[PDB]
Amino acid sequence: MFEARLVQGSILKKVLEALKDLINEACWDISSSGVNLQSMDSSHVSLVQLTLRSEGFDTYRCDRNLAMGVNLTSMSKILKCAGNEDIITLRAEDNADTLALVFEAPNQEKVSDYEMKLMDLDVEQLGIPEQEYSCVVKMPSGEFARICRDLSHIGDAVVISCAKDGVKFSASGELGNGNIKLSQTSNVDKEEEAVTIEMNEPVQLTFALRYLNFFTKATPLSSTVTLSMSADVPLVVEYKIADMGHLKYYLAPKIEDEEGS
Amino acid sequence: MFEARLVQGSILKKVLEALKDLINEACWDISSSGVNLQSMDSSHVSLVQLTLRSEGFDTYRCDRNLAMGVNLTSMSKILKCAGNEDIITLRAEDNADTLALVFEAPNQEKVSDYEMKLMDLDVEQLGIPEQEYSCVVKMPSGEFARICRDLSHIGDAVVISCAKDGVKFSASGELGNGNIKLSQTSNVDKEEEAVTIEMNEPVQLTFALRYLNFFTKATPLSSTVTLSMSADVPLVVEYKIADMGHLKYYLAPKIEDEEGS
Amino acid sequence: KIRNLPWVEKYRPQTLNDLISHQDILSTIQKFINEDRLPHLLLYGPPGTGKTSTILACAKQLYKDKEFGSMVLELNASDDRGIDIIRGPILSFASTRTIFKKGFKLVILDEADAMTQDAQNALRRVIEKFTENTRFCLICNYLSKIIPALQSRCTRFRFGPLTPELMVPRLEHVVEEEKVDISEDGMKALVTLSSGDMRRALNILQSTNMAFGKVTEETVYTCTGHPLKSDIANILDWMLNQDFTTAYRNITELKTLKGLALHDILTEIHLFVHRVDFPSSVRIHLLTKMADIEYRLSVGTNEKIQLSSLIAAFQVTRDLIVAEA
Amino acid sequence: IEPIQSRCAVLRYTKLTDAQILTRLMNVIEKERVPYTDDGLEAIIFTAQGDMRQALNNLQSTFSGFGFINSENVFKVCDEPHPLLVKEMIQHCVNANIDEAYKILAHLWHLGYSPEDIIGNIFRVCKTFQMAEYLKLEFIKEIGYTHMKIAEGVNSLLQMAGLLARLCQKTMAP
Amino acid sequence: SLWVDKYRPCSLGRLDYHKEQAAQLRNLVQCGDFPHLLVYGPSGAGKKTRIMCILRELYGVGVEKLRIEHQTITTPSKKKIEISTIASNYHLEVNPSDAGNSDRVVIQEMLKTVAQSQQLETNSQRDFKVVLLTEVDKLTKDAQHALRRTMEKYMSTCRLILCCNSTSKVIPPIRSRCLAVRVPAPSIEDICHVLSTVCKKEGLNLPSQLAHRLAEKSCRNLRKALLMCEACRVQQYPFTADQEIPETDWEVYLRETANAIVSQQTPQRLLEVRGRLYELLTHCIPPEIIMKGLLSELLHNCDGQLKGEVAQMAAYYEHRLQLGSKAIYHLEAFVAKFMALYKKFMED
Amino acid sequence: NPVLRRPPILEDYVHVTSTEGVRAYLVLRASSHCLWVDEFAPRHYTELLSDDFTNRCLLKWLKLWDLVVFGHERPSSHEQVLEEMLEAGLDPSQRPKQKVALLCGPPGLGKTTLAHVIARHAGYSVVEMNASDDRSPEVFRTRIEAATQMESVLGAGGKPNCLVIDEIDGAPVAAINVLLSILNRKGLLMRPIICICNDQFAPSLRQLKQQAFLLHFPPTLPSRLVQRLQEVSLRQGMRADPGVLAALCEKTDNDIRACINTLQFLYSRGQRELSVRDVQATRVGLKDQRRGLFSVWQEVFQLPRASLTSASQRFYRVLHAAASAGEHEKVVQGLFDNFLRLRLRDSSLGAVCVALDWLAFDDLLAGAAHHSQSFQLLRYPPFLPVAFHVLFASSHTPRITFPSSQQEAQNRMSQMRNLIQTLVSGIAPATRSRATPQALLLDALCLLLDILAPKLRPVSTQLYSTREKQQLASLVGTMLAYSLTYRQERTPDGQYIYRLEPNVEELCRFPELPARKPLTYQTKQLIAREIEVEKMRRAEASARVE
DNA sequence: GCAGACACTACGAGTACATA
Ligand SMILES: Nc1ncnc2c1ncn2[C@@H]1O[C@H](COP(=O)(O)OP(=O)(O)OP(O)(O)=S)[C@@H](O)[C@H]1O
Ligand SMILES: Nc1ncnc2c1ncn2[C@@H]1O[C@H](COP(=O)(O)OP(=O)(O)OP(O)(O)=S)[C@@H](O)[C@H]1O
Ligand SMILES: Nc1ncnc2c1ncn2[C@@H]1O[C@H](COP(=O)(O)OP(=O)(O)O)[C@@H](O)[C@H]1O
Ligand SMILES: [Mg+2]
Ligand SMILES: [Mg+2]
C-alpha cells in the first residue's frame, strides 16, 4: 500500500512542467526514506533525479519497496485540472494496476479523483558516481533562468566556463558571441543572490540550450540553484526544493572539435 | 581602437527602434568628430543620416577612422535586453570582426558583453546636397506623429503643402478626404508646441504614409522636429537630440500624373 | 593593387567595349543609352555569355558613383522576390522619384526565371505604368519560365553562345595580364572545352595554370580530365573494328591508364556518330542506346557494366553495317 | 469562374493578322519618319507573331540600332520564332528522317536554347500537329518520358537526340 | 512466450550455426575501434540475434533490459510526428521508416542529437554508444544521404549497426562507409538441428521427416520454421511424419489469385483479380512480395518456353512499381500483360 | 548508299569490320440606365422561367411554414421523394421536418430569382446573406440570430423574414456547423431558411443534403427561353428569327443571363436584324463551362451520335473537356474504375495494357513533379483521358459509376496500419525488438492464431488432465505475452459473442479462403476467465517477490 | 498613482496548388 499526502499542491504544479517536454515518463521508487525518481531522456543526454523525503509529507505509508511508472501525456492534462493551494493525495494498491490522485476541485466544492494506468517499464538504475566535482557554484534561480533564456536568441548551444573568478556563459553563433559573467555578489540583502565559488580547478564545457531551458523551467520550486562540473563528469544542476527534498539534473557535454595540430 | 560610451541606454534603443523596420543594415562611420550613419532603406526610397557628436558620449576614443557595417536585427535583439539608465560601451578593434556592446543587467549586478560580426558592404558614399530649402517648419514631434497616424486611416499617400501660412496635410482616400492645416501655435505655455514658418516659396508634394510613420518613431529623441521641403530636393525630417547629435530623414516624392481630360 | 580573386571575377567587362561577341546587340544598347531611349530589356541566353556583365556595365555608364545607390534596385535569386516584395519595395521604388538628382531609375531583376508567376503577374502593371520613371531589365536562362505577358512588355535580346573566333582575344588579354605561357593548342583546347562559356574558359585556364604552370593541350586535358580526340577515335575504331573481348580490354586499359570518365566518352562518341556516315536505322539504334546508357549513369550504377553496354551498342550494329554493304 | 462569365459579356480577342499590325506600323513609321523596305516590315511582322507590343519593340530596337528597316537589320537584333522551326523537325520525326531532325535540333542547340525550352516547343508543336491520334499520344508520352529525365538533371544533346530517335522509332513500330 | 523468443541465444558462443562468423564477430568488436556494420541477408537468417549478441559482447547483460521511448519530431511542414524507439542504457534502436518519407527528419534531427552528445557515465557505458537503424533498405535516398556525414564525423563516440535484407537498396556512399556483414540463411540441416534442440528442450520428440518438411516449407526462415513447429505441436502433439503443416492465409490467397489469373483471360477476370490484389494490398502485404508470390505460382502453370518472358515481365513491372507510387497500376499491368501473353500462347 | 565496299579517295573514312572479317568503309567528314437582365427580371410568379415542378415544390414548402409563421391553418425518382416530403406532414412543433431548402444547379438558371420571388409571393421579407459578407463563424451566427430569432420592428403588419443564404457552397465548414446547430436547437427556429448553391457535392454541404429539402434545378427548356428572348428582342425593337435565338441558347448552355447579356452586346443600335454568323462566331458570347465528372466520363467513353465526324475534333474536344472539368485525380480514378466494365472489343488485351501504361505514365509524372519540384511535367497527364478516348470509344451506352475503389483501399489500409500499431504497442519491448512489425505480420500472425486455438473440449478445469492443464497454462502464457484477451460483444440478434481484444483476425484471415473451426463460447469464456485469474496470480506473485 | 478596457500588429496555423 502506497498512500502519500502533500502539504502544498504547487510543488507538483511546478515540478511536472519541467518534465513535460524533457522526459517521456515518470518512474517513482517507493521506500521508507522517501520517493526517488531517476529518469533518463530518450536521446540519452539528460538525467533527472528527484528525491522527496518522507519527513516532508503530511502522511506517508510504505510497507514494500515498490516502483510505479506513469506517463506524462495524461498526467500533464490531469495536473492542469487540479488547483494550486489544495492538498494532493497519491494512492496505489498492492495488486491493482492504477494510480489514484485525489485532490480538490478549483471550484472548491467537490473532490476530484483521477486514475492513471501504470506503465510496466523495464529500466535499470544507471548509477551516479557522486564523485568530487572540480567546480561548485551557487546562483539565483530566476537569474539563471533569465541567463539561459537570453542565450536562446543567439546560438543553439551554450558554453559554460568556471574558473575561480566566477561562472561565464558564452553563446557563439552566426550573429556574434554573447558573454556574461557573475562574480562576488555577497554584498546584497537577499541571501539567495549570493553568487559564490567553492572549488578551484577551472572547467570549460559546451552544453545544449534546449535541455538547460527545460532545466530552468523548474525555477520557483527553490530559492537558490547549485551548479557542479568537472573535466568529464556531466553538469549537475541542484535544486533544494523547500523541506521535503531535492532535485538533480545531469546534462552531458557536447563532442569537442578537432583543434589539435 | 574604437571605444564609445553611451551615457544612457534609452537613446540607442529609441534610435534602433526607429530604424528597425526601415533600415536593412547599420553603417557606422567613425571619426574623431563623432559617429556618422548614412544608410538607405530596403526600397531605396528613404535615407537616414544620423550624426552623434563625440562630446555626447561619456568617453570617446578613435585612433584610426573606421566604417563598420553591421546587421540591424541582431543589434535590435541586443538592444532589446538593455536598460534605459545604464552606460553602454561600444568597442571595436583595428582589424577584427567583433563589435562589442558592453552593458549591465536591469538587475544592475552582472555585466553583459554582446559581440556582433561586421559585414563587408563597401557601399559607395551617398552625397547629401546640403542646399537651402524653400520651406522650413519647426513643429512638435508628437503633433507630427499624431497627424501622420490620423492621415494613415484615410489614405496611403499624403499631399503635404507648405506656404507663408503654414503646413497643410491632405489624404485623398477611399472614405473621402482629410485636410488638416495647422499654423501659428506659438501662443502656449510650452516651448515645444509651436509652429514656425521660416522660408517663402509654397510647395506641394505627395509622399507615402508608411515611411512618414516610420520617421515619426523618433519622437522621444527630440521634442521639436524640423521639416524641410522644396520643389526638387526631398522632404527632410530633422530631429535635434539634446546633447548627443541629430537625425535627418530624407523621403522622395511619389510620381503623380495629371488627368489628360 | 592586387587582390585574391577568381579570374571570372578579377576580369569582368566593366565597360560595354570589353565584351566580345554580341556586337549588334551591344551597339543597339549603346545607342539606347546615348539617345536616352532605354526600354525594358529581356536578356536571355546560355550561362557565361555576359548578360549580368552587360547590365552592370550599362548601369555604371548610366549613373555616377555618387548616386548609384539611389537609381539602381538590383534583386536576384539570393534575395526574396515574392509578391509582397513586388507590391512593397519594388512598387515603392517604381512609384517614387529619385533623391539627389533627377533621372530615370533602373530595376535589375537578375535570374528572373526563378520568380514565382504571381510575382511575374504583379510585375506587369508596375512595368507598364511607371515606364517614364523607371526601367526594368529581366535576365534569364530559360525563356519558358517567364510568362508571355512579361515577354510582350520587354524587348528581348538573345545572348547566344560565344563563338571561339571572337573568344580568343579576351583570353589573350587575360593571359597577358597574368603572365601565362600558353601555346596555340592550349588556346584551342580552352575554346574547345569552354563551348561558348567564358566562365569555364577562365576557370579551366586558371586551374591549368595553377596545376601545371603552363597551358598546353596535354595540361588542359589532364587538369580537366577530358579525353583527347585521338582517344575517342581509338575507342570508336576499337568498337567498330574488332570483337567484344579485345575492344573491351583496349578500352579498359585506355580508361585505367588515362583516368577517363564515361560521361565525356559518351558525349564525344555521340558527337562522332553524327559525323560517321551510318545508315539511318543504325544511327537511331545508336542514339537510343547511348541515351539509355547516359541515363543509367545518373545514379549509383557500376561504370564497368555501362562501358560494356557501350561496347555492346556498337557490336550489335557491326554485322548490320557490314551486311548492308 | 463561370458565375462571373455569366454575369458579363465575354468578348474574345483573336490574334492580330499581318495587315492589321502593318497598318499600325505604317502609322508609327509615318509619325516617326522611319525609312524602311517591304522586306524589313515583313520581318518585323514575322518576329511580332501577332503581338503589337513585340512589333513596336522590334521596330524601335531596329531603328535605334541601325536606322533602317531591311531584313538584315531586323534579324541582326531580333530572332526568328521557335515553333515554326520546331514543326519542321516534328514533321521529319513523323517520316522517321533522323538526319534532318537532328540538323534542326543541333541548329537550335548551337543557338543557346536550353533543353527545357526546346522540349516545351516540341510538346507545343506535337499538341496541335496534323498526324494520327494514337501516334500523337505515343509522341506525347515519349516527350514526357524525356522531359522527366530533363527535369531530373540529365539534359544533354545526346538526350534530345535519343528523344528524336525514339520518336522516329514510334513511326516504324505499329 | 513463443519458441522464436524462448530459446534465442544470448551470446555469440551459444549460436547453433555460423559459428566461424560468430568467432570473427567476437574478434571484431573486442578492441572497440570496429567500424559501422551493415548486417544483411534473407529474412529469418538470424541477423537481429547476432546484432544483440554483438551488443551483449560490447556491453554487459543490461543490453537485454529494453524500454519504449516516444519522440516527437517537427517536420519542415511543422507537422509533429511521434516515432517509437527501442532503447537501453547502452544502445538505441530506431526504425525510421515508421516516419515514412519523413524518415530524413528522423535522421537530420533525432539522430544527430544522439551523435553530438557524449555518454553520461563512461564507466558503465563504454566510450561509444550504438544506434541500430532497422530496415535501412526501406529508407528513402534523402535519409541515406543525411546519414553519411553523421556516420563520418561522430564515428569515435557513436557506432552504427545498420540492418537490411538487400544491400542493393542501400546507396554506395553508405555502403562505402560501413563493413558489410553477410548472414546467410541456415541450411536444412541447421534448421533441423535447431528444431530438434528446441523440441528436446521442450521435452518433445521430433522426427527427421517432420523437421525436414518444416525446414523445406519454411523456405530457410528459422522464425517461420519455429512458429510452424509450435503450431504443429499445438494442433497435434503426437508428431507423425505426414502430419499436415499449417500455412499462412495470404500465401494461399495469392496462390488462388494466380489460379484465377490462369483460369480466365478476360477484362472481367482482370477486374476480379484487381479486387483480389486490392484485398492483398489492404492487408499490408508488400507489393514486391505479391509480385514474387505471383511469379512463383504463375511459373508452375506456364510451359517451358514462356517462363523466361513471364519472369522478365515480372521484373520489369516490379521495377516500374518501385519507380512509381501506386502499386495497383503496375500489379494490374503485369497481370494484363501475362493474360495477353498466355492467351497468345494458348491460342497459338 | 552510306556503306562503300571500296575505300574513299578524298574524304576521311572510318573502318567497320564484321565478326566474319569483312571490311566496310564509312565517311567521317430609365431604359438607358439598367441592364436588360434587370429590366426584364420577373416581378411575379407568372413570369418565372424555371421548371414548373421546382417552383410549385418551393412554393408548397414555403407555404408549409404558414401555420408557425403566419398563425393560420389555411394558407388561402427525384419528383416522388419531393412529393412525399411535401405530403409527409409536420412535426409536433407545428413546423416542417425539413426546415432548410437547399437550391442547387448550374449558373444562370434563376435560383436567386426563384427564391426572392417565392419569398415575396408568400408574404415574407427577403433577408439575404451572400458571399460578399464576412462569413466568419461568429458573424454568420449573429446574422442568422438577427434574421430568424426576432419579430418585426414595425410591429403588427410587418412582413416576416425569410433568410436567403446565397452561395453557401463557398462557406467554410464551421459556418455550416453553426447553421446546423441553429437548425437543431431544441432557441426554436420559427422562420424558414432557404440556401442556394451551385455545386451540391461540395464537402461542406454533405451534412446539409441529409437535412434539407433538396431542390435540383434542371436546365431551362429551350422553347421557353427562345420565346422569352423573342419577347425581350421585340420589346427592345430588334428583329431575330427563332433559329438564331435557338443557336444562341445552344451556345450559352441554357443560361438566361448570358443569353440576355449577349443579346444586349450584339444588338446595340447600329443594326436591327441579328445574323446567324454573329452567334456562330466565338468572339461574343462563348464562355468557359466547367464540365461535370459524369459528363466528362460519358464523352470519353461514348462516341457522339451521328462536320463533327473527324477524329481530330473529337480528340481536341475530349482533351478540352477533361481540362475544363478540373479535379484531375478524380477523373483518373473514374477512368481506372470504369474502363474494364465496358463492352471492350479488344479481346487480345492490348488496349488494356497500353491504358495501364498510360496510367503508370501519369503516376510517374506525378511522382517526378512532386519529387524534383518541376511542375512543368504536369501538362502531360491531361492527355491521359483523351488516350482512353482513343482506346475505348464505343457507340454503346456505358453505365459509368463513381470511383470508390482507390479510396476504399486507402481507408482500409489505414485501418489495417492502425490495427498493426495497436497490436504492436501491446507487446513487451523485450520481444518487440526481436521482430519487425512487417515480419510479425507476414510470419507470426496466422501461425500465432493457430497456436492460440487448440482443440479444447468443453470440460471444466477440475476434470482436465495434467497434460491439458499444462497446455492451457502454455496457452494463457502466450496469450498474456502478446497482451491478447477475449471480451464480450453484443449483437443485434441478441447473442453474446467473444472477440479478441486486439481483433487480429481481420489482419490474418482472408475472405475467399476455406473456413476453419473456431473455438466455442464455453472454451473462449474459460480462456478469458483464466487470463484474468492468471493476471491476478501474476500480480500476487510480483507482490510476494517484492 | 494603478487597475480595467480599447485597438494595434506580429505570429501561429490550416489549406491549396504548382501545366497549355
Ligand atoms: N562576352 C563576354 N566577354 C568577356 N567576358 C565575359 C563574357 N561573358 C562572360 N564573361 C566572363 O564571365 C564572367 C561571368 O559572366 P556573366 O556576365 O555572369 O554571364 P551570365 O550571362 O550572367 O551567366 P549567367 O546566365 O548569369 S550563369 C564575367 O565576369 C567575365 O569574366
Ligand atoms: N423569366 C426571366 N426572363 C428574363 N430574365 C430572367 C428571367 N428569370 C431570371 N432572369 C434573369 O436571369 C438571371 C438569373 O440569374 P440569378 O437568378 O440572378 O442567379 P442564379 O440563377 O442563382 O445563377 P448564379 O449561380 O447565381 S450565376 C438574372 O439576371 C435575372 O434577372
Ligand atoms: N543461432 C541460433 N540458434 C537458435 N535460434 C536462432 C539462432 N539464430 C536465430 N534464431 C532464431 O531465428 C529467428 C531469426 O529471427 P531474427 O534473429 O530476427 O533474424 P532476422 O533479423 O534475419 O529476421 C529468431 O526468432 C531466433 O529466435
Ligand atoms: Mg548572371
Ligand atoms: Mg445567385
Side-chain angles (χ1 to χ4, degrees), chain C residues 69-85:
Chain C
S70 306
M71 310 296 287
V72 186
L73 181 61
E74 211 284 299
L75 292 182
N76 38 84
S78 68
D79 311 318
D80 190 17
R81 291 182 301 179
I83 198 167
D84 294 353
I85 312 295

Side-chain angles (χ1 to χ4, degrees), chain A residues 102-132:
Chain A
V102 186
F103 46 86
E104 200 68 32
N107 206 31
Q108 290 288 332
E109 65 167 354
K110 59 179 180 179
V111 175
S112 180
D113 202 333
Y114 271 104
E115 296 186 359
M116 281 163 295
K117 293 187 176 184
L118 292 181
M119 308 257 292
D120 204 321
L121 206 55
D122 202 312
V123 300
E124 53 180 347
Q125 305 296 99
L126 182 58
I128 49 178
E130 303 157 351
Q131 222 173 359
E132 284 289 322

Side-chain angles (χ1 to χ4, degrees), chain B residues 78-94:
Chain B
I78 286 177
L79 260 302
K80 209 65 62 186
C81 48
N84 298 20
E85 70 272 12
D86 49 352
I87 323 116
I88 293 185
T89 309
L90 266 156
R91 297 212 324 267
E93 289 84 6
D94 301 328

Side-chain angles (χ1 to χ4, degrees), chain D residues 129-148:
Chain D
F129 201 75
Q130 216 285 336
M131 51 178 167
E133 290 84 29
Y134 189 43
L135 189 65
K136 177 176 296 185
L137 292 156
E138 290 173 4
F139 269 46
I140 286 169
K141 190 163 65 177
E142 216 70 57
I143 285 157
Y145 273 138
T146 305
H147 200 188
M148 265 186 281

Side-chain angles (χ1 to χ4, degrees), chain C residues 12-57:
Chain C
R12 180 173 285 271
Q14 307 284 90
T15 57
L16 291 177
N17 290 326
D18 303 5
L19 298 131
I20 39 141
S21 182
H22 319 86
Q23 289 307 110
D24 300 318
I25 298 179
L26 285 183
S27 302
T28 306
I29 296 174
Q30 185 59 59
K31 289 171 182 179
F32 278 146
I33 293 178
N34 292 334
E35 296 162 9
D36 210 333
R37 309 262 187 271
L38 186 71
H40 311 285
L41 302 177
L42 174 53
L43 268 52
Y44 68 104
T49 51
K51 307 179 291 295
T52 310
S53 301
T54 299
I55 200 51
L56 284 180

Side-chain angles (χ1 to χ4, degrees), chain E residues 2 5 48 66 221 235 246 249-250 274 276 278-279 281-284 320 324-325 329 332 343, chain F residues 336 340 347 356-357 363 406 412-413 416 433-434 441-443 450 455 478 506 509 512-513 516:
Chain E
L2 301 170
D5 298 348
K48 185 60 183 181
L66 304 162
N221 196 315
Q235 69 184 17
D249 267 1
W250 63 270
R274 192 224 288 187
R276 298 190 69 103
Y278 270 129
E279 194 77 22
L281 287 168
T282 274
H283 283 59
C284 300
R320 292 220 312 177
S325 66
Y329 289 160
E332 205 190 28
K343 176 178 288 297
Chain F
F336 179 61
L340 284 182
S347 300
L356 287 157
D357 207 332
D363 173 54
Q406 298 195 27
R412 221 145 55 95
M413 192 184 307
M416 288 307 180
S433 64
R434 303 197 180 193
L441 165 81
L442 292 156
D443 298 5
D450 190 26
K455 267 166 292 302
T478 188
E506 38 176 331
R509 304 290 174 260
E512 306 176 28
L513 275 66
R516 276 168 294 274

